[PDB]
Point group: D2
């Protein structure tokens, strides 16, 4: 309902350290592109290790014992997340616009989804600030024993492009309610909203240095953070391989604590006794939502022989109806893909489906060649050791498979290494619970998809991540336990 802001100008483009804007010590810069209209948006600073080293020495001092930040009341600190979520509320249209320009997200989605889940998250942890509680333990008669949940220190964050501002805030909200200091590196493809937030961080009244942002490239700024011996903890949302790199690097350097979220082969089981019109509608915007690029995307769609053939028919129509086009269009649901090797990579496995035996159903190739739009594709007769079904596609592709027994899909669903999310659609009570118990996903939606809450944790099983975000469990990743044991005369 808000008016699209189509010629909004990029006002913020630099490294943000100690609440100040900076030109990269390198002097270099780099540009960010608008995937909707292949066009250059703006040129931002190109950070590197020297810049990163600059920001950490800032967070180190902002975290120093006795600093203005450390002294703050636990509630006063929680009072800043509030009033920084307030500011996000104010400039909600500005940020949603920035997010669309740089990502091709339908401006509708960026408003009611991305920035919604962002202001929500900022508020949940704003309340956790003064409720971070340790324990008092019974020990011996003569001993007092208790535990304090102290902040970890300088925490680095490295986010992806599929949800630039959201995935970032998921780490900033808990890390700051716990009393840490942060050095952030946003994905180069989408650094606009990360830096704009930097302004509000200053406007909200945060002490200088508690948060710093250094835009740059993965190897350049990213790796420099994962290894910095002064950063005490890392948070990474990205590719499973880079995830293996970050943790291994942090291992070699100072044994800093690391948490990872990597997405995976998220199964979408659909039993014979489901509300198909629901299962189709959710499994549809679950697979296709946000141009298809999402960690929780529905890679493999299982269906029972009882409604397998009927399902494939139902899905086909939804896919076609899904409008593709301008992001700032008010009637769009899917815009362009992110960048080039993505547009190419996606179109690759599409034919890999054609070329491997998968019965296509809708939209074999791309369209609207000016931009990077892809025809929402659907696949049938998919089998376990195919490519569309075995890999992590990103663009809109809905490979649908067949299954027969509940134990069959329980086994075939866990056959992967990527247990991040799993949907299940049944009106049955035991089928719904028996599945939810044996499925090895970190999250298990039932009769719904993409049901994230700043209250419920989100994390990966197996090779999908380490630890959880987005819950009360999120505080565990931003606090170090200290045991205090006193003996009395």
């Amino acid at each position: 309902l808000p008016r699209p802001i189509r010629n909004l100008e990029v006002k913020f483009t630099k490294i943000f350290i100690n609440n100040e804007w900076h030109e990269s010590k390198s002097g270099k810069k780099f540009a960010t592109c608008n995937p909707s209209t292949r066009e250059q948006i703006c040129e931002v600073e190109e950070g590197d290790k020297p810049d990163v080293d600059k920001a950490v020495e800032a967070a180190q001092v902002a975290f120093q014992r006795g600093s203005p930040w450390r002294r703050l009341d636990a509630l006063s600190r929680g009072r800043l997340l509030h009033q920084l979520a307030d500011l996000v509320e104010r400039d909600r249209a500005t940020l949603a616009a920035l997010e669309t320009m740089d990502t091709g997200k339908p401006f509708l989605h960026a408003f009611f989804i991305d920035l919604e889940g962002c202001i929500r998250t900022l508020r949940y942890f704003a309340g956790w600030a003064d409720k971070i509680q340790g324990k008092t333990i019974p020990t011996d008669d003569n001993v007092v024993c208790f535990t304090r949940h102290e902040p970890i220190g300088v925490c680095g964050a490295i986010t992806p492009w599929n949800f630039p501002l959201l995935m970032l805030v998921w780490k900033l909200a808990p890390a700051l309610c716990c009393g840490n200091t942060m050095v952030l590196k946003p994905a180069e493809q989408t650094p606009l909203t990360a830096l704009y937030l930097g302004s509000l961080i200053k406007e909200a009244g945060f002490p200088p240095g508690v948060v710093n942002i250094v835009p740059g490239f993965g190897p350049t700024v990213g790796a420099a953070i994962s290894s910095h011996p002064q950063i005490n903890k890392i948070a990474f949302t990205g590719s499973t391989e880079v995830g293996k790199l970050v943790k291994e690097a942090a291992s070699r350097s100072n044994l800093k604590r690391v948490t990872l979220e990597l997405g995976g082969k998220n199964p979408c089981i659909v039993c014979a006794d489901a509300d198909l019109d629901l299962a189709v509608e959710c499994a549809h915007q679950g697979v296709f939502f946000n141009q298809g690029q999402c960690c929780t995307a529905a890679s493999r769609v299982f269906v029972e022989e009882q409604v397998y053939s009927e399902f494939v028919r139902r899905s086909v129509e939804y896919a076609k109806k899904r409008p593709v086009g301008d992001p700032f269009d008010v009637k769009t649901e899917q815009g362009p893909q992110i960048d080039q090797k993505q547009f190419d990579k996606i179109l690759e496995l599409i034919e890999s489906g054609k070329k491997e035996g998968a019965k296509l159903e809708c939209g074999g190739s791309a369209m609207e060649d000016k931009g990077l739009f892809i025809k929402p594709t659907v696949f049938s007769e998919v089998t376990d050791n195919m490519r569309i079904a075995k890999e992590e596609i990103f663009g809109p592709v809905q490979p649908i498979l067949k299954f027969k027994s509940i134990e069959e899909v329980i086994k075939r669903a866990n056959s992967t290494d990527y247990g991040l999310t799993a949907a299940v659609f049944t009106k049955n009570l035991d089928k719904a619970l028996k599945l939810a118990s044996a499925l090895e996903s970190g999250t298990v939606w039932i009769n719904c998809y993409n049901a994230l809450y700043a209250q419920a944790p989100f994390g990966g099983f197996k090779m999908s991540g380490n630890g959880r975000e987005l819950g009360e469990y999120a505080l565990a990743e931003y606090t170090e336990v200290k045991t205090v044991t006193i003996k009395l005369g």
Copy 2:
């Protein structure tokens, strides 16, 4: 004590059956106290690990007798095993001494008592591992289950072999997890015996698998095996870096590390010196100076520094030395001679810089030590006491914290503000006060900074042996 106590178990333990290494090879653990040999032990390797892992996987899949037990049934077993260990207690302290050269009392009354208490404590957590029911919307049911991770890899050191092994097995077992255990090579005896007790109390086979071997051979195989979902390591810092590296490169498997560190020890002017000097003694020179909690540094205040160095020294050489099985002694020998060599050398490291030594081989006390020296800059990990002077509270806070090794710490004052002020500031997983080595199966152990990451020995221990699954249900 038990004089000529035989050794019955030496083999790879898988599915409650004793196995010969597919390598067919064997290594011989020797008696560190009387340099002589005890027995040879099947040297496991990747093929052997390849079995136990797949064994644990089987005993862990759905429907397995292990997976299907009532939580209290799971806990009852841990209470059964801890009983057997309670029953065979002398035998273990015997092996622990025969295998590490530790005072048979220290082995009987500390190691095993901690093993026994730690086991019982987690038998109670079995049916008390609770998730959350989360408020989300009106028509939405949301909640989280704390499921077991799966096959867990445990790798222990020779410091407190069996205890270090329990600290991981106990909590890992009061959850779904099955295990594959690689003890040290200097000290594999007690770990192997416990495998007997494990089969004795009816743990369904494959739940626990012990595979003795070497560091780069068996340990390196676990930290990189793609079917092990979690690792718990306790040992050298640098060796931990590799396991975390390996785990990160292969399986993204969860890893929790218990490393070492230079553990500061602070004595304020208002200190009960007789307690401060004494506690600082058994916190440096206890168990032959080798221990994760040993105090590498000892900060003392001007008003007491000189007097502190005095009674430190006088009481320093009161520990008698002798045979492990002797009630006379509190200290035995060492295991390897890289420690011995690196200690007597380190002793002369502090002499190059200005450092006045207060009191060779067959129990040292250093003094007037600044921070910029080897005697205060490195993990001694051997009987040596580097004492330092200081004035301010903010002074020691920045000094003791300047290191990368926050594991433990000990403060000695009678003052309320000094006690708490120091406790809140010291960057250490544990912060003792007017005591040392005051460990409890109720309080979580673990380290700050590079001293490790993760926590054992508490309710926090459960966090490292469970994966959190969220379940979000919508209604119509």
Copy 3:
């Protein structure tokens, strides 16, 4: 499978104080009867206030600061519950026999049900001993703040006859793992097992005075406890009216903390899409289990018009097949009723059902006149403002009602004041959860009945109780919170 012990002799019959057996200061005594064979079992002491005053001065000293009990390690204390559950394990056949002699419980049930749930409960809280944990709170920069969960002190327990040993242990297990001292009064109808346990309490190694038992009558010993100004907390499982008396008394006397469990008009909803053969079998032994006398008994049985007529038919056969007879009989499920005014009271409302329009189905009156056995009765066409459906019958009676909409039964089910337990049988997912959410029972079984665990809490909604037993929540009722706030110079 254990051999019934039919001439077991009552070896324990006296007040147990400071680990010693005593004759009532009154000098009086009273007898307990075996309802199976109207017969006198034995004569026990008759306690009164002076005896009660004796036991409290014992618990007061056993709880005194520095006593052997207070000094104990939290684990050592937990080590005593274990090894007292061990002893119960040993003499399991003795106690189950005692419980049958004095209550008419089928010796099968007393073994695998009563003493099972007793040894289970003793173990659960044995582990909670050294895991009773307070909190450490964030406050101001200069302040340390934390909470200790201290024991309350002398806690009195007053149990009923429907489950003498179980309902008692439910209070003793948590109260003792928390470090309190207890003064217990068992129901006069069933004091045998309460006193025998007293022996094991001493054998287990408990310090003298930590637990005391004074058998007697409600007004005599019971009221004397509820008012004693030295008892700090009460636990009462019994009738809703006596429950009103105890809390009001404790109110007038010293404001002692009180927890209550009173049973009620437990609804047993059965939807049209249930596994009837299950719903019937559970709703049957749910209504009829233990001669019908139970807090969780199924008073009102709702059924959907879709399977209403079919249900009533199915239930009828089960009821007839239910064998009534000798308790020590190995093929029995229901024995005699407890005592006289119960046998009369139950038989009253039976005709109240006949006389009010309720279509009888099986067993209108009693049988086997030697003892107090009743024919398992079933009723149809039951309506909301009848007597069998509106009251708290105890004997075997299964008034079955009709219902149509889910909202109809949600409203009609909460139409009472006794929300203790509620069963619900459906294969449906939403019907199962939507019901469980809106039903105002303290416990809500689904596709099952009588599913109690020493891990899950059991308590009453509305006028069915205050607080919970049988969970981790049980510790809240046996501990007082203390805030400690220290300011630093």
Copy 4:
């Protein structure tokens, strides 16, 4: 300050509409400081309570806009109201002073700040009220929900009217519960105004209902109403006994009581007297000597007793007395004259027995007081300081604990063992150390023994406004 500030609200507040008592009667709250009247206020009674209750029931039934809000939506409102109170802050401190005669600063910077902070603290708990997922069997799903109790009855005193009212409304509202509020009769003004703010921030009508009236008339109606599922009371001890009696006789409704008590205050030889004497001052004579936390007793050790009595007395009469709106003063008047009468009489109660008074009407300091006296045996509840001597730590422990009133307590030492040893032993809900009235919306308030039962002001506060439902599901 605000000089001639008018009063706009005086009526029964139900469904966000202002109502005239079905009695048609009114009572007139007077200005305790300048004995004169402020306004008349609709005197509610059983018929009026009969409405608000049924109103709350409606706004609480399923599907009501209140029941159906997202937890965070519920919390957002509490953040909205606390903002309005933040916005109208002077107006409330004005009324609080106009209505109780309290220093307009004490009203503005304590009462309202506590009201504001307490509101925000519970706005955060709204979406963080989590139950458990319990391990039971293999084929069983078990878990507990923490549902709201329902219509909650709150009855406050004139000590800190609005604050005492928030402490109950705030947590009760960050749960399902709707409320019916009976403030005191001496001080109904601020409670009535907040009803305006409540309608202002869009709380769906019927969620909160304020019914001013008298103790035996409106309060007695609530404590016995059969549709109110819970009560929270803060006031006289004996009056609490009746509410618990009434609640037990009618509805078995849940009741949590915050009563008074004689709150010991201990000063050890190692005490920072300037802090001990000072804190003991504002912990007895603060807010005109009337307060639930006032220190009725003050145990001091021999080595400091005499000197303590000295500087206690010298600094005793430093509080200036004057008009409430004056920045000069820290103390105003009292409300009723049963307090005044019963105080000057109690002052001479300690003179009958041996008790030497150190320093009439228009600020007393007693001394040499044994325990067997009125000045140490009863709730003063008025400015009076009974000091006592003692030697042992175990001595004061048994003395201070011998009472039936454990509410608060204050220890003053610099020693670690003395501090903790006393903290663990004192039977009090709160045990301050080197401070007094150090209240926090994070730490739970409440009393031991007869000082009440239940806890406000913490995460424990949520326990008293939720009923635990267990859900056990079996699978086939």
